C-alpha cells in the first residue's frame, strides 16, 4: 500500500492520480521541493527544440522508450530517485504528458502550501495564502484603485448586465 | 401539496413517453447509459418515485389526493414495450383506446377488453353500478360470439338477441366528440338500455334517442334526476320514474 | 526526416495506418505508403494520420514508410480507357497496364448545378426491347437495373451495350456512348468471359471497364466507381454520351460498410452508416444530362444493384430508389419461368422514361404497356381473352432470348407486328420463328422502311402502311 | 479569431481557435479556404478546440490551417431577392443568375415565436384533392408532412401540389430542396422557368427556392433547413405573406444530423439516430407555424426510412403535424394514385364540427366502410368470399369503388399518366362518396370510380362500359 | 497502466525508484476486487490460467494475462479480498482429483466432498 | 525478429517483438513451444507488439517468453503425399501416420490467380454421374454448393466422386474436414480406407486430407481452409492437375472465422457475420479456378446457415456459385442412389449458350417433362393417376424412367450394397434420357432405367429383365 498525501494541488486522476503518487514519496523524505526546483529547470531543458524530438521524440522507432531518460536526463542528476518515474514516464508514453504533472506539481509546488482565488472583476487575483478576503483586501491595498472593475470588468456585467437580465 | 392539502389533484402526464426519450437522451449526453430500448432503466425508478407521490392520502394529509392519470400515446400498439411494461407493473390498469372503431367512428374507439381498472367499484356510483355491471358483461357476451369463432355472425338465437342488446349498448357508450356529461345523465341513458327500451330501436338511432331523451330528462327529470343525483345511486323514487320514463319517454321519442 | 510529409506507421494492423507524422499534409491527399500502396489520408488527427490503405497490410510491416504523394487523389479521366479494364488507379489490369487515361480528374468534383444542366430527352437505348419501349429514357438517368445474380441480369447488360455497338459503331453522335462498366466485386473469371463477350462485342473500344473482380481490396474498389465517375462526367461533359453500369454498388456497399464499422464508425440501419447514402447521392448526383455548354452531356448511369431477395424494403435500396429516376426489376421467377428477358415489370419503371426516347415507339409502346398491364390484370370473356391471346403472345415478344438486341425501328416493327395482333393470327410458339422469317423479310426488302423508320424516329402513316403491307403479307403467308 | 485545422476528419472539422472559442453556433470561414468553407461551432470541446462542422469539400486542409471566425453564427442574405432564385443554403445563387443579393442577412439559427402571437387555431386549406381536403383537411400555415416513400409518386405530388395551390396562391412559396436531387430541382426549374412563376422578370417571383442538395455534405444539409426558415420567416412575418414552404425532404436533413452524431462524437441515437432528435425536431419546427405574422404553410417532404413510420423519426413526426399526409405505398402499388394512406393521413382538424361535420360524417361513413372492409382483408385473404356475410359484399364492392373513386390522374403529370388528371371541388366529392354510400352504383363497373376526379365523371366511366 | 501505475501503491515509491514487493509475476497485489475479479497487480509468468491462491486462502485463476495485471477469477468472494493482497501463485493450473473411485461420491467442482461424505476415494489428481 | 509474449489474453498473444514488425500474417513460432504454437501476426498493434492469433491453445502459460518470428507465414508441406494422408493445418499429420513433407512448403499465402492467368471461359466440366453431366454438368475450375442428408450414401457419394474425378482428368482432391467432428473424421478415415479411395498403399490416394477439427482453435479451424486452399494451388498449377476442392462445411469454416472476427473485438458484419465475410471469403474465393496450368474447381460442402441465404455468408456465396447441388433425401427416399434433388441441383451457367444448345436443351427437355410431370404428381396426387392422358402416362413413365435411370449404382459401394455402379460418359447421358424421351423404349422395364450408368445399359437391363 502507500499513504495518501495532497500539499495543496491536487488535481485526482490522469496525472493527478500519478502527481499525489510523488506527492506522498517525495513529500516523505521531503525531497519535494528540491524535486520541485529540480522538476522546474528539466520543464524547460526538456520542452525544447534542440530537441523537437531528442528529449521528447517519443518515435520515429522505439529506442527513446527502451532509454533515452532513463540515459539523457539520467545522463543528468537532475531527478536522481525521482528521475526513475520519469524513466516510467518515458517507456510508459505519457512524456507529453508530463507539463501538466509539473503544472499540477509547482501550481502544486508553490501555491503547494498557499491560495488562489479570483472573485468577480478581478482577475490577476490569484496567489498562494494561508487566509483569504483580509489577504484579497490587502490587494485593494495596492491601491484601491486599479481593481474590481478592470482587467475583468464590472463595465457590461456584473452591475451593466444586471438592469438588463430584469428586462 | 395539493393533496397534502387536501386537495385531489389530477395530473394528466401527457406524456411520460416522451419524457424518457428526453431523460435517455440526457443521460446519453452524460454517457449515463441507453438501458433495454436504448433508456437506461431507472426510468421506471423515475417514475415509480415520480407517481407514487400520486396517491390518496388520509385526512392528516387533508384526505386529499394527487390523482394521476399518467398517458402513453404508443407507437402502434408497443406496450410490452419497455416503458409500456414497466408502466404497466405500476399501473392498475391500462385504458386501452382502440383505433380500428375510430375508423369505424367509434371514437371514443376503446379496447375496453384492453381497458382495465383492477380497481373497478371503488371508483364509483351505486347509480352506475347497478346499470353498468350487468352491460359490461352483455357487452361481453356479445364480443363472445362473435369472438369463439371469430366471426360476427352468431352460434345461437338466444343471443341473436343479446347482440342486439350488445349493439345497443355499442351506440351507447360513445361519447360524442368534444363532449362530457355527469353521472345521473349518463345512467339515465344507461338504464334505458341496460333495462332495454330500446332494442325495440335500430341501433344507429339510439344515440339520436338520447339527445332527445337526454334533453327531455335534463327537461323533466332534472326532479328525479334530483333524486339519482343525491342518491348516487337509482332510488326507488328514480327508477320507479325511471321505469316508467324510460317506457312512456322511449315511446314518446319513438312514436 | 519529413515526419511531415510522410509518416512511419504507427499502427497497422486493422490496416489502417496510424502514421505518425505526414503534417503539412493538406486534407484529402493521396498518400503513398511503402509498399507501392495507396492511401488516404482520411483522419488528419492531431497526432497521426488514419489512413485509409489502398492495399493490404501483409504487404506491409511497421513503422512503414508513408510518403505523401503530395497529390488529392485523382483518377484518370480522358479516352484511353476506352478499350482498357482497368484498376480504379487506371492500370488496366487486363495486363495491358499503361494505357491509360492520361489525364486524371480529382474524383472530387461534384454534381454540376441546376443550371449546368438541363435534362434527357437522349434517346437511350439497350435495343431491350423492354426497355427502349416500356421504361423509355434520356441519357443522365441514374435507372436502377435490378434483378438477382446473373439471372441473366448480366446478360441484360450485354445485350444493352450490343445495340450500342452498331452505334457506336456508328456516328451515332447522341450514341456514341462511352459504356462505363463498373464491374464490382465480380470474381475476375466471370469477368474474364463477361469481357470476351465484350471483346467479341468490342465495344471495348468505346468503353471503360472499370473492373473490380471479386477479391480485391475494397476500398479500392470502393474508390473505383468514383474514379468512374469522374471519367464518365468526362465524357458527358465533353458533350458525349456515358453509360455508367455501376454493376453494382451492393458490393460497394458491403465493402464500405466492412470498412466503416472498422474504421470504427457507426452503422444504423442495416449495419450500414448513412452516408452510403452520401455514398450514393455524392457518386450519383454527379451523374447528369447536362446543359448545352457541357455538350448537352450526358453520363447516363445505369446503377445495378443485382438483388437479393427483392428487398427493397432495405433501407439501400429505398435510398437508391428515391436517388434513381427508376428502376428496373427483373424477376428471376420469370426467368425461371424461362422468361427471357424475366423481368418484373409491375416493378420495373420509368417515373422518368417519359419524352427522353423514342417517339416511333411510343405511338406503339405505350400502348403495349397499357395492354400488357390489362393483360396481367386479368391475372372468361372474350374481350380479356383477346388480351389473353395477344398477351401471350405480348409475352413472348418482349421476350427476347439472352444475346440479342436491336436497333429501334425493328423493334417497333415487330410489336407492331403483334399490335395488330399480326402476332394473335399466331400463337405463342410460331412467334420467333416468324420474327426470325419476318425479320429476315423486312431486311431484305423493306430495308427501305427499316432504314426510314430509324430515320422518322416517329411512325409515320406512310411506314405503316407499307409496313402493314409488307407484314401483312409475310404474315399471312406465313402463319408460323 | 483563427483555429488551425486540428483534425480534419471529413467535414467534421476540429477547430482549435485558440484565439477565444467564439460561441456554440459561431460560424466560422476558413483561412486558406477561398472557396468559402463554412464551418459551424458544435462544441466548445475543452482545449480552445471546437468540434465545428464544415458543411463542404475538406481539400487542401493542412491541420494547422487558419480558420477565421466569422464572428457570428451563420447569417445570410433574407430578402425579396431570393423568389425566384435559387439559392443553396449559402445565400448564394444556383439559380445562377448572379448573387442572391440582399439588403438584410440573417442569423439562420433562431428563436422558435411565443406561443402568444402564434395564432392558437387554423383552418382547413384546400387542395384540390377530394382525398385530401376530405380526408385529411389540412390547414393553411399548418405544417403538412408528407410521408411517403421513395419517389413514391410524391414527387410527383407535391409538385402537383405546386400545381394545384402555388399558382392560386396569394402570398409566395419557398422551396427548400433538402437532399433534393439536383435533377428535381432542375426539373422543377424548368418547370418552374416554364411556369413563368418563376418569371425572371421577378427575383420576386412567385417561389424562391432554396436548395441544399443530396451531393452536398450533410452540414450543409442539416443547415439549409434553417437557412429557408430563416427566410421564410422572414417573409412571412416580415413580409407579412402566406408563406407556403415547400420542404422537400426533411428527412434528408434529418438523416444530415444523424449522419454526423456518430461523428459528433455522440451516440447516434436508435439505429444511429441522434438523442436531440427531437429537440431538432422542436427547433426547427416550433420555429415554423402560422403566427399572427402570417402563415407559413409548411410543407415537409418526410421521407419514411423503410417506410418504416413506427420508426422514431416519424413516430415523433406525428406529433408535429397539423397534418400528417401519410402515402400508402401499399394504394401506390395498385397504381392508384391518389395513393395515400388516409387512415393514416390526418388532420387534427378532421373532427366533426370544424370542417363542417357533413362532410366529415360523409367520411366517417367511408372510413368507416373502408376500415371495416379493411378488417376483413386477413379473411378474404384465405377466404376470398363465398360463407361470409352480404351487406359486407355490398360493401367490398362499394369500397371497391370507393377506392377507385380516391383515385385521380395526373393533371401536370400527363407525361406521367398519360391521362389527364383530374381536380374536383368539394361537392363532387363530398357527395361522390355519398353518394356511393347512397350505392347508386352497385351494377355500375367498379373499377370505373378509377382515376377520376369528378364522382359525375366517373359515373359516366361506369357507363361507356355499362 | 492508466490509473494503475498512476495507483500508487507502485507509483507511491516507484518515483523514489523504491519498490521490491511481489514477484508481480509470481505473485501479485490486488489491483481491483470487485466482481470476484481481481486484477492483480503483476503476475507475468504466472502459469496462464492459473489457480492461484489469494491472501485470503482463497483461489482464484489467473486467466488473462494481461500486461500489468492478471485478470483472476476469484473462484469466490471479493468482501474478503481487498485491493494489494497478495495473490501468491501456487504455480498451478488446475487439476482435479482424478481417479475411478469418485464412485460413490459427490463433489464440488474441484473434485471434493460437498456430499458430506467426507472426502472421496481420489488419489490420484490429474490436470 | 523475436517476441515475448507481453499477453496472453487467450489466444490473442499479444507479443511485443522486440524487433520489428514483419509484415501482418507472419507466422512466429513462440520458443518455449513443445507444440509449434505459431502465432499468426494479426495486427501490428504497434510496439512491434502484435496481436496475434495463437495457433496452439494458451494451457498454463508464463508469459514474455521468446519467440522466435518465423520471420514469414505458417508452412506446410505441399505436392502428392497429402494424398492419402491426413494432416493438420500446420501441415502436420494427424494421419498419425508419420510425416508429410511434400517437398515444398507454404505460406498459405499463395494467392489469387490473376486477371492474365484465368481461363476467360472455363466450360464445362462432367462428373461421371449423369445426373449432373445432363442437367448440372460441372465446370472445371467451378465452385459447387452442396447441400444433402448426412450419408444418404452422402459421403459415399462423395467418394464417388474423388473416384470419378481423381481419374477422369488425371484430378485430384483436397479434403478440409472443416471443423471435422474428429470422432466422425476417425470415422471418415475409415471409409475412404475402407474404400480403398484412401489407399494406404498410396498416399497419392485420390484425396489429400486435411482435418481441422472443432477441438482446434477457430482461427485454426478458419485457416486449415487457405492451407488446403493453398495445396490445391500447388496441384493446379504445379501438379497441372484438376484439383478438388472439398470444403467441408465452408459454413463450419465460416464459423470458425466469425468467431475470430468478433473476438478480435473487430466489429464482424452485422449479426456477428464477419466484417470482411466477403472478402475472406473472395480472398480465398479467388483462389480458384482454371488457371492454365489446371483447375481447383471446389466442390463446397455448404450447411446453408440457418437455412437462410440472404443471410450474408451465402448471399455472397451465391456469388461463388455456379451449380449448386441439393442433394434430395426425398431422392434418396425414393431408394435411388444416387439421391440428387435434381431441379434442385443446378448450373445456371447450363446455358444453351454455354453448354450445347443442344445439351441444355435437352437437358432442359428432361425439366420440362420432369418438372411438369411433377405437377402432374400433384394431379396424380389428387386421384390417383388413371386421371391422365395416356401420353402424360408415359412421359410418367419416361420420368420414372428417366428417375430410375438418374439411378446408378455405386461403384465404390459395388462391394458394399452388392450394388455395383458405372460412369456414365456424358453423350449417352444427353442422348440417354433423350432417347427415353424419344420415348421408344418407353415401352421397356423400368429398373432397366434402375441404376445403370449410360443408357445401353438400361436397354442391356430392360431385356434380360423382360
Given at each position: ?9 491536487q ?9 499525489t ?36 521524440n517519443?518515435?520515429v ?5 527502451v ?78 484603485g ?22 | ?11 394528466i ?11 435517455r ?38 384526505g ?18 419497455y ?9 392498475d390498469?391500462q ?5 380500428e ?5 367509434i ?25 353498468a ?10 364480443r ?8 360476427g355472425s ?12 350488445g ?7 360513445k361519447?360524442?366528440?368534444?363532449s ?5 345523465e ?23 334517442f ?22 348516487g ?18 315511446a314518446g321519442?319513438?312514436a | ?22 503534417r ?29 490503405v ?62 449546368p ?32 445474380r ?98 453494382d ?7 464500405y ?54 428487398d ?52 406503339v ?5 397499357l ?32 444475346y ?20 394473335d393470327?399466331?400463337?405463342?410458339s ?51 | ?41 458544435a ?8 468540434r465545428?462542422?464544415?458543411?463542404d469539400?475538406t ?21 425579396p ?23 438584410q442577412?440573417?442569423?439562420?439559427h ?16 384546400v387542395?384540390?384533392?377530394?382525398v ?64 413563368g412563376?418563376?418569371n ?57 444530423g444523424?449522419?454526423?452524431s ?13 438523442p ?37 423519426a ?30 393514416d ?31 376483413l ?7 376470398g ?47 361522390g362518396?355519398?353518394q ?18 369528378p ?12 | ?16 525508484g ?7 509475476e ?32 482463497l ?69
Open positions: 500500500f502507500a499513504k495518501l498525501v495532497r500539499p495543496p494541488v488535481i485526482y486522476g490522469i496525472e493527478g492520480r500519478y502527481a503518487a510523488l506527492y506522498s514519496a517525495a513529500s516523505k523524505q521531503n525531497k519535494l521541493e528540491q524535486v520541485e526546483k529540480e522538476l522546474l529547470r528539466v520543464g524547460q531543458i526538456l520542452k525544447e527544440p534542440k530537441m523537437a524530438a531528442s528529449l521528447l517519443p518515435y522507432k522505439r529506442s527513446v522508450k532509454k533515452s531518460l532513463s540515459d539523457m536526463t539520467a545522463k543528468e542528476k537532475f531527478s536522481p530517485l525521482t528521475s526513475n518515474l520519469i524513466n516510467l514516464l518515458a517507456e510508459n508514453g505519457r512524456l507529453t504528458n508530463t507539463p501538466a504533472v509539473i503544472s499540477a506539481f509547482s501550481t502544486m509546488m508553490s501555491v503547494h502550501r498557499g491560495e488562489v482565488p479570483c472573485t468577480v472583476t478581478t482577475a490577476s487575483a490569484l496567489d498562494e495564502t494561508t487566509l483569504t478576503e483580509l489577504k484579497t483586501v490587502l490587494k485593494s491595498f495596492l491601491s484601491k486599479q481593481v474590481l472593475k478592470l482587467e475583468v470588468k464590472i463595465d457590461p456585467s456584473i452591475m451593466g448586465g444586471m438592469i438588463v437580465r430584469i428586462g | 401539496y395539493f393533496r397534502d392539502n387536501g386537495k385531489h389533484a389530477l395530473i402526464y401527457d406524456d411520460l413517453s416522451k419524457q424518457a426519450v428526453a431523460y437522451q440526457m443521460s446519453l449526453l452524460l454517457r449515463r447509459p441507453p438501458g433495454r430500448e436504448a433508456y437506461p432503466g431507472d426510468v421506471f425508478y423515475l417514475h415509480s418515485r415520480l407517481l407514487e407521490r400520486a396517491a390518496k392520502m388520509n385526512d392528516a394529509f387533508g386529499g389526493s394527487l390523482t394521476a392519470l399518467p398517458v402513453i400515446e404508443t407507437q402502434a400498439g408497443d406496450v410490452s414495450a416503458i409500456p411494461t414497466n408502466v404497466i407493473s405500476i399501473t390498469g385504458i386501452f383506446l382502440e383505433t372503431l375510430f375508423y369505424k367512428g371514437r371514443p374507439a376503446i379496447n375496453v377488453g384492453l381497458s382495465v381498472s383492477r380497481v373497478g367499484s371503488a371508483a364509483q356510483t351505486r347509480a352506475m353500478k347497478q346499470v355491471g350487468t352491460m359490461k358483461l352483455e357487452l361481453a357476451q356479445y363472445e360470439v362473435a369472438a369463439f369463432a371469430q366471426f352468431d352460434l345461437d338465437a338466444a343471443t341473436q338477441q343479446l347482440l342486439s342488446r349493439v345497443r349498448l355499442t351506440e351507447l357508450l361519447q360524442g366528440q368534444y362530457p356529461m355527469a353521472i345521473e349518463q345512467v339515465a341513458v344507461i338504464y334505458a338500455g341496460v333495462r332495454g327500451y330500446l332494442d325495440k330501436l335500430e341501433p344507429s338511432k339510439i344515440t339520436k338520447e339527445n332527445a331523451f337526454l334533453s327531455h330528462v335534463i327537461s323533466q327529470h332534472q326532479a328525479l334526476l334530483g333524486k339519482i343525483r343525491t342518491d345511486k337509482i332510488s326507488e323514487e328514480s327508477d320507479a320514474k325511471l321505469k316508467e320514463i324510460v317506457t312512456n319517454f322511449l321519442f319513438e | 526526416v519529413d515526419l511531415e510529409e510522410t509518416g512511419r506507421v504507427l499502427s497497422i494492423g486493422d490496416g489502417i495506418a496510424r502514421v505518425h507524422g505526414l503539412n499534409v493538406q486534407a484529402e491527399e493521396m498518400v503513398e505508403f511503402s509498399s507501392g500502396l495507396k492511401g488516404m489520408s482520411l483522419n488528419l488527427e492531431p497526432d497521426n494520420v488514419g489512413v485509409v489502398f492495399g493490404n497490410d501483409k504487404l506491409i510491416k511497421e513503422g512503414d514508410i508513408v510518403k505523401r504523394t503530395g497529390a488529392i487523389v485523382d483518377v484518370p479521366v480522358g479516352e484511353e480507357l476506352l478499350g482498357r479494364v482497368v484498376d480504379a488507379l487506371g492500370n488496366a489490369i487486363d495486363g495491358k497496364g499503361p494505357i491509360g487515361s492520361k489525364a486524371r480528374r480529382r474524383v472530387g468534383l461534384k454534381a454540376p448545378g441546376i443550371i444542366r438541363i435534362s434527357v430527352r437522349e434517346p437511350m437505348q439497350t435495343g431491350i426491347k423492354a426497355v427502349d419501349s416500356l421504361v423509355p429514357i434520356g441519357r443522365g438517368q441514374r435507372e436502377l437495373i435490378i434483378g438477382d446473373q439471372t441473366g441480369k448480366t446478360s441484360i447488360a450485354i445485350d444493352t451495350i450490343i445495340n450500342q455497338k452498331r452505334f457506336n459503331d456508328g456516328t451515332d453522335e447522341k450514341k456514341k456512348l462511352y459504356c462505363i462498366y463498373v464491374a464490382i466485386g465480380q470474381k475476375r473469371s466471370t469477368v474474364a468471359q463477361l469481357v470476351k463477350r465484350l471483346t467479341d462485342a468490342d465495344a471495348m473500344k468505346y468503353t471503360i471497364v472499370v473492373s473490380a473482380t471479386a477479391s480485391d481490396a475494397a476500398p479500392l474498389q470502393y474508390l473505383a466507381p468514383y474514379s468512374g465517375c469522374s471519367m464518365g462526367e468526362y465524357f458527358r461533359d465533353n458533350g458525349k454520351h456515358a453509360l455508367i453500369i455501376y454493376d454498388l451492393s458490393k460497394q456497399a458491403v465493402a460498410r466492412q470498412m466503416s464499422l472498422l474504421l470504427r464508425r457507426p452503422p444504423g440501419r442495416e449495419a450500414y452508416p448513412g452516408d452510403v447514402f452520401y455514398l450514393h447521392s455524392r457518386l450519383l448526383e454527379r451523374a447528369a444530362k447536362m446543359n448545352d455548354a457541357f455538350g448537352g452531356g450526358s453520363l447516363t448511369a445505369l446503377p445495378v444493384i443485382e438483388t437479393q431477395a427483392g427493397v424494403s432495405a433501407y439501400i435500396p429505398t435510398n437508391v430508389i428515391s436517388i434513381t429516376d427508376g428502376q428496373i426489376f427483373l424477376e428471376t421467377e420469370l426467368f425461371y419461368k424461362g422468361i427471357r428477358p424475366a423481368i418484373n415489370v409491375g416493378l420495373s419503371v420509368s417515373r422518368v422514361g417519359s419524352a427522353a426516347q423514342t417517339r416511333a415507339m411510343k405511338q409502346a405505350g400502348t403495349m404497356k395492354e400488357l398491364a390489362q393483360y396481367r390484370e386479368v391475372a372468361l370473356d372474350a374481350a380479356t381473352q383477346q388480351l389473353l391471346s395477344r398477351g401471350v403472345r405480348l409475352t413472348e415478344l418482349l421476350k427476347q432470348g439472352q440479342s438486341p436491336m436497333a429501334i425501328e425493328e423493334q417497333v416493327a415487330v410489336i407492331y407486328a403483334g399490335v395488330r395482333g399480326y402476332l393470327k399466331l400463337e405463342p410460331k412467334i420467333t420463328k416468324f420474327e426470325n422469317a419476318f425479320l429476315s423479310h423486312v431486311i431484305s426488302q423493306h430495308q427501305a422502311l427499316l432504314g426510314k423508320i430509324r430515320t422518322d424516329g416517329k411512325i409515320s402513316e406512310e411506314s405503316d402502311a407499307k409496313l402493314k403491307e409488307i407484314v401483312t403479307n409475310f404474315l399471312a403467308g406465313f402463319e408460323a | 479569431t483563427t483555429g488551425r485545422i486540428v483534425a480534419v476528419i471529413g467535414a467534421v472539422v476540429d477547430v482549435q481557435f485558440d484565439e477565444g472559442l467564439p460561441p456554440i453556433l459561431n460560424a466560422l470561414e476558413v483561412q486558406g479556404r477561398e472557396t468559402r468553407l463554412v464551418l459551424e461551432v462544441q466548445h470541446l475543452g482545449e480552445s478546440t471546437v465545428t462542422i464544415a458543411m469539400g481539400e487542401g486542409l493542412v491541420r494547422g490551417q487558419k480558420v477565421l471566425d466569422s464572428g457570428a453564427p451563420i447569417r445570410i442574405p433574407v430578402g431577392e431570393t423568389l425566384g432564385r435559387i439559392m443553396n443554403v449559402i445565400g448564394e445563387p444556383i439559380d445562377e443568375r448572379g448573387p442572391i443579393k440582399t439588403k442577412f440573417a442569423a439562420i433562431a428563436e422558435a415565436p411565443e406561443f402568444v402571437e402564434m395564432s392558437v387555431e387554423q383552418e382547413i386549406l387542395t384540390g384533392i377530394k385530401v381536403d376530405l380526408l385529411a383537411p389540412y390547414a393553411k400555415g399548418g405544417k403538412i408532412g408528407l410521408f411517403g416513400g421513395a419517389g413514391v409518386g410524391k414527387t410527383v405530388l407535391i409538385m402537383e401540389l405546386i400545381n394545384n395551390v402555388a399558382k392560386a396562391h396569394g402570398g409566395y412559396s419557398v422551396f427548400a430542396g433538402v437532399g433534393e436531387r439536383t435533377r428535381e430541382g432542375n426539373d422543377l426549374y424548368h418547370e418552374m422557368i416554364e411556369s412563376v418563376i425572371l422578370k421577378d427575383a420576386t417571383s412567385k417561389v424562391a427556392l432554396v436548395y441544399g442538395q443530396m451531393n452536398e455534405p450533410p452540414g450543409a444539409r442539416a443547415r439549409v433547413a434553417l437557412t429557408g426558415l430563416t427566410v421564410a420567416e422572414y417573409f412571412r412575418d416580415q413580409e407579412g405573406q402566406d408563406v407556403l414552404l415547400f420542404i422537400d425532404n426533411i428527412f434528408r436533413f434529418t438523416q444530415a444523424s449522419e454526423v456518430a461523428l459528433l462524437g455522440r451516440i447516434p441515437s436508435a439505429v444511429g439516430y441522434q436531440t432528435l427531437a429537440t431538432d425536431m422542436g427547433t426547427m419546427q416550433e420555429r415554423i407555424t402560422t403566427t399572427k405574422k402570417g402563415s407559413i404553410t409548411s410543407v415537409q417532404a418526410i421521407y419514411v426510412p423503410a417506410d418504416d413510420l413506427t420508426d422514431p416519424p413516430a415523433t413526426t406525428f406529433a408535429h403535424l397539423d397534418a400528417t399526409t401519410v402515402l400508402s405505398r401499399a394504394i401506390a402499388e395498385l397504381g392508384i394514385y391518389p395513393a395515400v394512406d388516409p387512415l393521413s390526418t388532420s387534427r382538424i378532421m373532427d366533426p364540427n370544424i370542417v363542417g361535420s357533413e362532410h366529415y360524417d360523409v367520411a366517417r361513413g367511408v372510413q368507416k366502410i373502408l376500415q371495416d372492409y379493411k378488417s382483408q386477413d379473411i378474404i385473404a384465405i377466404l368470399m363465398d360463407e361470409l356475410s352480404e351487406e359486407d359484399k355490398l360493401t367490398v364492392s362499394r369500397a371497391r369503388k370507393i377506392q377507385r373513386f380516391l383515385s385521380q390522374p395526373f393533371q401536370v403529370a400527363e407525361v406521367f399518366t398519360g391521362h389527364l388528371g383530374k381536380l374536383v371541388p368539394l361537392k363532387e366529392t363530398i357527395k362518396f355519398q356511393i354510400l347512397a350505392g347508386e352504383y352497385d351494377h355500375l363497373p367498379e373499377q370505373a370510380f378509377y382515376m377520376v376526379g364522382i359525375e365523371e366517373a359515373v359516366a366511366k361506369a357507363d361507356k362500359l355499362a | 497502466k492508466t490509473g494503475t501505475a498512476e495507483v500508487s501503491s507502485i507509483l507511491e515509491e516507484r518515483i523514489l523504491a519498490d521490491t514487493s511481489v514477484d508481480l509470481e505473485t501479485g497485489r490486488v489491483l481491483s476486487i470487485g466482481d470476484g475479479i481481481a486484477r492483480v497487480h503483476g503476475l507475468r509468468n504466472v502459469q496462464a490460467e492459473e489457480m492461484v491462491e489469494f491472501s485470503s486462502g483461489k482464484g485463476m489467473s486467466l488473462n494475462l494481461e500486461p500489468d495485471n492478471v485478470g483472476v477469477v476469484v473462484f469466490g468472494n471479493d468482501k474478503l479480498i481487498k485491493e494489494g493482497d497478495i495473490v501468491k501463485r501456487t504455480g498451478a493450473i488446475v487439476d482435479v482429483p482424478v481417479g475411478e473411485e469418485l464412485l460413490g461420491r459427490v463433489v464440488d467442482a474441484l473434485g471434493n466432498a460437498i456430499d458430506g461424505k467426507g472426502p472421496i476415494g481420489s488419489k490420484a489428481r490429474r490436470r
